[PDB]
Amino acid sequence: TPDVFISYRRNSGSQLASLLKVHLQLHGFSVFIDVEKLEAGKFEDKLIQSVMGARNFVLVLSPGALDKCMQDHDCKDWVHKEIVTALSCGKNIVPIIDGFEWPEPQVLPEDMQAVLTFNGIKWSHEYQEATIEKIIRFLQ
Amino acid sequence: TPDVFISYRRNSGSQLASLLKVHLQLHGFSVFIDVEKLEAGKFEDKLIQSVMGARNFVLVLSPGALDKCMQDHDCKDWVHKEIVTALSCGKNIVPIIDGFEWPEPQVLPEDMQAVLTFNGIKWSHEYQEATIEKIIRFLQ
Ligand SMILES: CN(C(=O)N[C@@H]1COCC1(F)F)[C@@H](COc1ccccc1)c1cc[n+]([C@@H]2O[C@H](COP(=O)(O)OP(=O)(O)OC[C@@H]3O[C@@H](n4cnc5c(N)ncnc54)[C@H](O)[C@@H]3O)[C@@H](O)[C@H]2O)cc1
């Protein structure tokens, strides 16, 4: 029922993810971010259904955002889990690049390596309105 | 003419500072932040005029936000200059605390120790709108 899911890393991406939420809602999108819209019940189900329900998966690539996905053999890391769901479901994946270094794909789990083939949007501190505009152009 | 001046550290606080700006604009307040409002001319002049011009001074205390203030005995650091300006002008100072560890006064320059005597607001990741509502209570 939301159009946009926001996947982010708390310890480096929380503030950016929130700013993305606020801007997109301003522009008429219904947005899921965990802190606003993850409510009662077993969260493993709710989180994954929430990815499945949104056309758009916006992924915040703050510095090191994918480091916990590395060597996540049992799929216990939540950004890992969200990306796989977005990939499996063929979502409109929009990476947002905020000081991220592109790792060699093979440091990532096979089931999320394809995340790096989607075109991302550089988050510009100096030109935020234009960044926001570009993100809206990408959204389906 | 701006009602609110946002002073912040770029390396740790740029996202929060932009998040705060949007929320305050949505609530009808005119906000200076550099990356939107600092325009042509000598920036030393224009910034200081901007602090002097705004009833309210929102200071973003991201972690280590005052580190480059300490031992800054010549007032070269920009967060130091902004604070000193807001103090001298008797501005409504509003600290926003986001993982900031409170320092002993003695480690700060004498000219800006008084900033620690102001009542600050805890930035809550889980209750952002409540945080924003409290900030607006503080503002004049
Ligand atoms: C004039 N400057 C700009 O960045 N101008 C940009 C153009 O319009 C928008 C804009 F503001 F972003 C900078 C000036 O730097 C210094 C710093 C020391 C000595 C001389 C200049 C600016 C401005 C404002 N604040 C205030 O303080 C706080 C941030 O302080 P700090 O986190 O510690 O910031 P810093 O990272 O040490 O400064 C970074 C510098 O900022 C840029 N940059 C430096 N030179 C100039 C210059 N000539 N013209 C344009 N940009 C300049 C370069 O990126 C440098 O890296 C905030 O509250 C701000 O209000 C600090 C530095």
Ligand SMILES: CN(C(=O)N[C@@H]1COCC1(F)F)[C@@H](COc1ccccc1)c1cc[n+]([C@@H]2O[C@H](COP(=O)(O)OP(=O)(O)OC[C@H]3O[C@@H](n4cnc5c(N)ncnc54)[C@H](O)[C@@H]3O)[C@@H](O)[C@H]2O)cc1
């Ligand atoms: C259900 N959890 C919540 O945080 N719930 C909060 C209450 O409602 C709103 C809310 F979401 F903020 C967490 C669950 O954590 C884990 C983590 C590992 C194993 C089991 C549970 C959640 C949820 C969503 N995301 C998604 O992923 C990304 C964030 O990933 P990371 O930065 O890496 O995340 P983390 O911060 O390391 O999470 C662990 C922390 O999460 C909290 N916390 C853990 N337990 C629960 C729990 N039972 N109920 C509430 N909070 C819980 C504690 O603060 C833990 O330290 C985003 O894209 C999110 O969509 C990750 C973790």
